[PDB]
Amino acid sequence: GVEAPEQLEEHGISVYATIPMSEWLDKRQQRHRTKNIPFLAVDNPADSAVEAVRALRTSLHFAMMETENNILMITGATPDSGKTFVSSTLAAVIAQSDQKVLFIDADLRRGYSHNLFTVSNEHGLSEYLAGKDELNKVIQHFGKGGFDVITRGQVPPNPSELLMRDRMRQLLEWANDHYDLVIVDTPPMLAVSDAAVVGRSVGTSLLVARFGLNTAKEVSLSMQRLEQAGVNIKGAILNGVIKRASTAYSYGYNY
Amino acid sequence: GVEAPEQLEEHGISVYATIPMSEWLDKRTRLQRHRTKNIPFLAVDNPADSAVEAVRALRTSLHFAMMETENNILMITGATPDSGKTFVSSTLAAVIAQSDQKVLFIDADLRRGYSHNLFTVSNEHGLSEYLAGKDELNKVIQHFGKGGFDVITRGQVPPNPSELLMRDRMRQLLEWANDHYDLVIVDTPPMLAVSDAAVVGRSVGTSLLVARFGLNTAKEVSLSMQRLEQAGVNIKGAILNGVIKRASTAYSYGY
Ligand SMILES: [Cl-]
Ligand SMILES: [Cl-]
Ligand SMILES: [Cl-]
């Protein structure tokens, strides 16, 4: 188990941000509206988890200085890292700054951001890459967050083959000229190569490891493998960080 | 003066909405550190306000009117100066954006638009710079954080306002925009002040005229719709804005 920012620095891994977990988020005469609860970034802006994401923004602001490419790929070591939380909150935070952001859910097998943004999943990433849908037909707007999104679409029979099609390249090149920041949420590296095939058309790449769940080893093993591939892995993010119990104990099995 | 909708229906002028005045804003209202970067924007501040509910109604009427008519450009002009045309269009922009819709707002009042001041965004690269061929499209499209929609400001006042609107990039812009946004709102200078609305109106698919409660007369309004007619511009109707119930009067004027 990780649990400590410096517990990564020692491995040489640079941590762009440490994000604590929100407890309020676990608690979770006509007029007509839409969408459902809950989106932390807009609901509780003062939240401690959100304030940290802003610090994540300030970090990328520098980091992402003169790289020409404005596509930032977010991925995790393994499943349940809270990477979708980090990425979606980052999108909201950056957009809120008067910035044009495009969020794409590249987890063609298990992306669920359509549920989080309470948006349709009929036309998404898979339909486009397969050639069924034109680009403008798969880009929708997440009202509550104030940014544009592309859901995963209907789970395809050939996830990986689709990610390698030329259309993924056309999309990122196109997207890079129309948005100030393009966030790509991808499957964990320790689960599929997908992040390596897409991480190769991106300027930045941040791996998100969860406090306690991830062993500082795999976060290096993940970055290492993305390095074998042309992927330009910058640092890492420590998500989950939960503290103050006045004792001495945690969790993390040893392999 | 003029107060209806009935007084408007009379001259055949079809009224899509009646927006009451907002006392909550008349006062300007105002219900650590690191603050925002804007000013009071009713649509997101007091959402349940009666002026915003009126706009929602406008949305509904516009939805039926803009029923399978394909062209998604909506031009909102006024009969005369200070008719509240910007409060109306900016509010509608926000409302429609919140329904998970990609919207583009453009200030086509190259001489007195102030929407950049309202959205408190930059005004160095705007419509005028783009129309003159100086700037590029992606350069002039910015994002309004609070509202959640994309905007294009006027830019620096050009020496040849009208000549630029007849350009060619105006059309080129509008049709390009029509393919990347679900809704395109174009704010134009008062019809009885310049010919601009009629030159731009020839590329919009729908047009609305906003008349102010008490300041306008059922005369000048139908006169504007008429001269827009001569130019071959789809003027679907009008909007009564400012309506302040529970009151009286104390002015004077006529023609
Ligand atoms: Cl996840
Ligand atoms: Cl294009
Ligand atoms: Cl005006």
Curated annotation (Swiss-Prot), chain A:
Disulfide bond positions: none
Residue intervals on the Cytoplasmic side: 1-255
Post-translational modification: Autophosphorylated. Dephosphorylated by etp.
Protein origin, superkingdom: Bacteria
Subcellular localization(s) per the UniProt record: Cell inner membrane
Family statement drawn from the similarity comment of this UniProt entry: Belongs to the etk/wzc family.
Protein name per the record: Tyrosine-protein kinase etk
